[PDB]
Amino acid sequence: LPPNAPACMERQLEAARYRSDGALLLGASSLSGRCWAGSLWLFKDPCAAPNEGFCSAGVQTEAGVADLTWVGERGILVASDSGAVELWELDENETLIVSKFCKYEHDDIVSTVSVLSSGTQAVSGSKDICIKVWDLAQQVVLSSYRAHAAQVTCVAASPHKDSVFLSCSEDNRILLWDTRCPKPASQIGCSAPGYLPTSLAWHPQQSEVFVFGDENGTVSLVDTKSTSCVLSSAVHSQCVTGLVFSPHSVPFLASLSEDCSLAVLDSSLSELFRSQAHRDFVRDATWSPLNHSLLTTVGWDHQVVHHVVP
Amino acid sequence: RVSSGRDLNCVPEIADTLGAVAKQGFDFLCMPVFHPRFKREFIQEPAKNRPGPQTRSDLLLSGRDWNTLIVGKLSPWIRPDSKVEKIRRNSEAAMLQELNFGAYLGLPAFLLPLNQEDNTNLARVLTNHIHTGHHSSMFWMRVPLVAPEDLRDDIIENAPTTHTEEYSGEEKTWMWWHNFRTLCDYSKRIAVALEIGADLPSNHVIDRWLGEPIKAAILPTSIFLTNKKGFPVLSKMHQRLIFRLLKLEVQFIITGTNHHSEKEFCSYLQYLEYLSQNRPPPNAYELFAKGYEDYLQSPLQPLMDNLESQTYEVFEKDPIKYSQYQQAIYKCLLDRVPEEEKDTNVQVLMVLGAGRGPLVNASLRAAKQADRRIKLYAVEKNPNAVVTLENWQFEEWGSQVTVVSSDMREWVAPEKADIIVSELLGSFADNELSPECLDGAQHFLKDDGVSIPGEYTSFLAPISSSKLYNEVRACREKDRDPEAQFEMPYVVRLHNFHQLSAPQPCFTFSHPNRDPMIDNNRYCTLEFPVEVNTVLHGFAGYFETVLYQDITLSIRPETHSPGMFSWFPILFPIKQPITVREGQTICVRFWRCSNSKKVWYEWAVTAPVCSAIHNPTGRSYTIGL
Ligand SMILES: O=C(NC[C@H](O)CN1CCc2ccccc2C1)c1cc(NC2COC2)ncn1
Numbered sequence A: 001l002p003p004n005a006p007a008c009m010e011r012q013l014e015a016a017r018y019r020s021d022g023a024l025l026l027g028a029s030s031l032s033g034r035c036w037a038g039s040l041w042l043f044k045d046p047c048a049a050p051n052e053g054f055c056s057a058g059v060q061t062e063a064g065v066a067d068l069t070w071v072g073e074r075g076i077l078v079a080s081d082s083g084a085v086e087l088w089e090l091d092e093n094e095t096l097i098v099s100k101f102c103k104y105e106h107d108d109i110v111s112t113v114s115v116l117s118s119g120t121q122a123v124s125g126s127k128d129i130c131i132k133v134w135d136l137a138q139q140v141v142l143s144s145y146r147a148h149a150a151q152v153t154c155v156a157a158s159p160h161k162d163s164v165f166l167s168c169s170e171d172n173r174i175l176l177w178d179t180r181c182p183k184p185a186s187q188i189g190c191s192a193p194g195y196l197p198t199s200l201a202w203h204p205q206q207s208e209v210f211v212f213g214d215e216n217g218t219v220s221l222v223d224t225k226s227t228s229c230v231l232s233s234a235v236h237s238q239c240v241t242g243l244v245f246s247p248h249s250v251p252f253l254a255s256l257s258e259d260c261s262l263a264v265l266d267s268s269l270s271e272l273f274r275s276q277a278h279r280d281f282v283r284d285a286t287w288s289p290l291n292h293s294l295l296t297t298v299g300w301d302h303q304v305v306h307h308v309v310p
Numbered sequence B: 001r002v003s004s005g006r007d008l009n010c011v012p013e014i015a016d017t018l019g020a021v022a023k024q025g026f027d028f029l030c031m032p033v034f035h036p037r038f039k040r041e042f043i044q045e046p047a048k049n050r051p052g053p054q055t056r057s058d059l060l061l062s063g064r065d066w067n068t069l070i071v072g073k074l075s076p077w078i079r080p081d082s083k084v085e086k087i088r089r090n091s092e093a094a095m096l097q098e099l100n101f102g103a104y105l106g107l108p109a110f111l112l113p114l115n116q117e118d119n120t121n122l123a124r125v126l127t128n129h130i131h132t133g134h135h136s137s138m139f140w141m142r143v144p145l146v147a148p149e150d151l152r153d154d155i156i157e158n159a160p161t162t163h164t165e166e167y168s169g170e171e172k173t174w175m176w177w178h179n180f181r182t183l184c185d186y187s188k189r190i191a192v193a194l195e196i197g198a199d200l201p202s203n204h205v206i207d208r209w210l211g212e213p214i215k216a217a218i219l220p221t222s223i224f225l226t227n228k229k230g231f232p233v234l235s236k237m238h239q240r241l242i243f244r245l246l247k248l249e250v251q252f253i254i255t256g257t258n259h260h261s262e263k264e265f266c267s268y269l270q271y272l273e274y275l276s277q278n279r280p281p282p283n284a285y286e287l288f289a290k291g292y293e294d295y296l297q298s299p300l301q302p303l304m305d306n307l308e309s310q311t312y313e314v315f316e317k318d319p320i321k322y323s324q325y326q327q328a329i330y331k332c333l334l335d336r337v338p339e340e341e342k343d344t345n346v347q348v349l350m351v352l353g354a355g356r357g358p359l360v361n362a363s364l365r366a367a368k369q370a371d372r373r374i375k376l377y378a379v380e381k382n383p384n385a386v387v388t389l390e391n392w393q394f395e396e397w398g399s400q401v402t403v404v405s406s407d408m409r410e411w412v413a414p415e416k417a418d419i420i421v422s423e424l425l426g427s428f429a430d431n432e433l434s435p436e437c438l439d440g441a442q443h444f445l446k447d448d449g450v451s452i453p454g455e456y457t458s459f460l461a462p463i464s465s466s467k468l469y470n471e472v473r474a475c476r477e478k479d480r481d482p483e484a485q486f487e488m489p490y491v492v493r494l495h496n497f498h499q500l501s502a503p504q505p506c507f508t509f510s511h512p513n514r515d516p517m518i519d520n521n522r523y524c525t526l527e528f529p530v531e532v533n534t535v536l537h538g539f540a541g542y543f544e545t546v547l548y549q550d551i552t553l554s555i556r557p558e559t560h561s562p563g564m565f566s567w568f569p570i571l572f573p574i575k576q577p578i579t580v581r582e583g584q585t586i587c588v589r590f591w592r593c594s595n596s597k598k599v600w601y602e603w604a605v606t607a608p609v610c611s612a613i614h615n616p617t618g619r620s621y622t623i624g625l
């Protein structure tokens, strides 16, 4: 167990992300009991997680971790319960995790963060109904947008365009953003007003295709220019909380749900694989960079599961 | 000082957090009782069987702190009115669970949002909880002045923000509240936590809300401007609303994070304290009226009952009623006896209902001011007060005053009067039966005799108020008609109400009454132009009286005598609230009725819809003769 690393990892695993060199990032929250906090973990040995003794680094955050993402190769950007967005920067030895900035700009829990294509900016989404654009270098809010009418569920930067991102909210709107326009947002999809949208993944190749999951367990594939629902499937029995495309040439889609199961689908949304290895909510999926058939899930059951995918 | 709390949606350690906010100056704290992000499953496995604990422990605070310092918040994910069946069911179960936990803890209040139009299921579940077990807890419905949809930045290229004004649309928020509390049958446990936005809505809204049961006002830090010294303050218009809310006596809740890093948090609060101790101080009236806000007092029997010594004592302190009577007697004397006659002419004055003597003394002071000569009779039917009078007569007044212990309608006067003086008036002028009394007494006034007072007029205005509608509802008793409480007028210091139209005259009486055949019965139709959307809950009653010439008394708000606490307004409720729309006319009809034994009012609303005729036959209320 490394220096400045907590002895105990809070039960509720919120996020799991592989760096390009193969190491695994973990976010966790204490969602019950006396202390309602959170922590950040680095695992250069992916198979060792979630074991606190066999990690490379680790740190306590003041409050819970609602979302996180890698920033480049050493930065870790965090959406906190405290309303703060924070940046933690990895040690040069990569054995300490150190706070870089912690700005209290939202008025309620920050629920979602995404890093923009350039890696110099980021966008956050909150229950305070706002969406915010950050200069990571200068540690400030550049823009604050109140487009929505209910809490913001998810925000996802386009793979390649530094001013384009998707967002979705409990006001039933999926907004396509482009900050070059005087009126930055545009209402999309949901061709007939449907069930609330709960998760978003851009296509990693066709920068104009995305998928969205809804509260009723349906994953749908959208074309931006066509604006008709190209295909959809009832993949889950409950809310779809995350969608993650594989690094593959022909990319597979990992779908995760509050029904506690993981699914994997081809480009036409057909079921290829399904794991009920979890016994509580599945919260993140991350595809191995080193082995494109390995996939890692975390849940509130505190299980870190590694899947093999055809 | 102001009583205030911190809204928080993040609490890592309950003990530390409570301490920080305590130090900053807050009186209480609004916080989740379960972790806001901790979605629970109740039906399908395996998540149904998530090992506990479900939340943190009651042991973390003393019972006393739970009861006094904490307000619970419902979990933001609880959506009883979702379109998805599974979400509805889980939200029901979770809602029950969180409410049961607050009741278990003994929390004094618990916040739930109204943040959309449909809250039918939320209301149903809350109503079910209210009618299960025994607890006193308040429920604060968090509702905004301006709906979130109507506050959004105009930044969606293909969904513009429709800039053309909707008179109705901008009141959608009040209709959310109104539907909700209607489904819940006006439960006295369901109050409003009103959220103020950066852009205040149009004025028209704010007026109504102030008739509603507002227990708290929520101020987000983001609505605060920042001054010369970099401190948080509020716009002139936000100050107005704050001052209204203070007059109402709500609790203030600061929500959101610190948007002025250069200062401590308590700076927001310091500003509220600032505005508070910067109100105009209590005027003479408001000092005496201070404990009486919206307190209903049931009808008095002026003839059949006798006033208590302490009742006379409190009213004898009126700073204006007596000096106004002194002046009226002063003017009348001068006019009745010219200068050359100032010693040949001794005027006969009769105080009819002399109580413990203040109008006898006022009479004497009026003569020793006009330099004229008077003989006084003091008539009083309350034999207990007659005790005070007769001791006054022996120790002080001497033979100038003749105390008579009887009813003025019964007394055989030894001689006729130049002037009869009386103060027999109720809040609705004639509801202590001043007419009947002076009618029966007038036979002993001289043919050119003056009556002080000379006349009085009653006034009515329609009003809106859930708080008062509930107060009345709560006056149901065993062993009488279950709706009798709605069929009688109450004297009340109306406070949490909205006046829907300007007062209009109702009944008028003149004294003496040289009507060939005297008839005190009355029927009057009133038409009240209303210019907001609202709910009619009853009619405020007021009066005005001419004592003599320009010397008057009034509780009509427009012409209210200064400092005169002696009469509060009266309230005539209606059995059923009636919806009124902007532009509509309220038509009410009042009758004064009587027989040889008693006098009563009956009333009915006939536009925009009819009510039941109230109090037919005097079945629920009469005043005995
Ligand atoms: O309007 C009220 N009662 C209706 C009665 O006709 C008032 N008159 C007023 C003059 C008077 C004088 C002597 C004896 C009795 C009375 C009763 C009322 C006002 C109030 N004022 C508070 C006492 O301190 C302010 N409290 C409770 N009731």
Ligand SMILES: Nc1ncnc2c1ncn2[C@@H]1O[C@H](C[C@@H](N)CC[C@H](N)C(=O)O)[C@@H](O)[C@H]1O
Residues within 6 Å of the ligand: B302, B303, B306, B307, B315, B316, B352, B353, B354, B355, B356, B357, B358, B359, B379, B380, B381, B382, B385, B406, B407, B408, B409, B423, B424, B425, B437
């Ligand atoms: N019909 C009546 N005959 C004689 N006394 C009456 C009659 N009706 C009411 N009173 C008395 O008139 C008084 C009315 C009071 N509001 C006035 C009290 C006193 N004059 C004062 O102004 O302080 C009460 O003390 C009643 O008991």
